């Protein structure tokens, strides 16, 4: 239970053209399941209740 639900992100120069490409590419990573392949370094552990 979190109080003010937000996210992380990638900050960028104001209204540059390179936003809309990375905005696709991150979603492509979410489209491929590679975050759960990146789980092996990320938040797994011992005794999560």
């Amino acid at each position: 239970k979190v109080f003010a639900s937000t996210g992380y992100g990638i900050a960028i120069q104001k209204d540059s053209g390179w936003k809309r490409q990375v905005d696709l590419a991150i979603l492509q990573l979410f489209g491929d399941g590679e975050m759960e392949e990146l789980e092996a370094l990320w938040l797994t552990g011992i005794c999560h209740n």
């Binding site: 003010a4 937000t6 996210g7 992380y8 992100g9 900050a11 104001k14 991150i26």
Partner: protein
Amino acid sequence: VGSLTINEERSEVVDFSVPFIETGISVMVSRSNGTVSPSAFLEPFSACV
């Protein structure tokens, strides 16, 4: 790139990407000792028995 949250006071100057890892404001409590119920199990035997 790195650990950097999203809020309103920073979004005026900086543009942001798609949210990336779910997070928020939480609270870590102490590692207290285990407790049983504050009463004996007097729940509803009194209704019928």
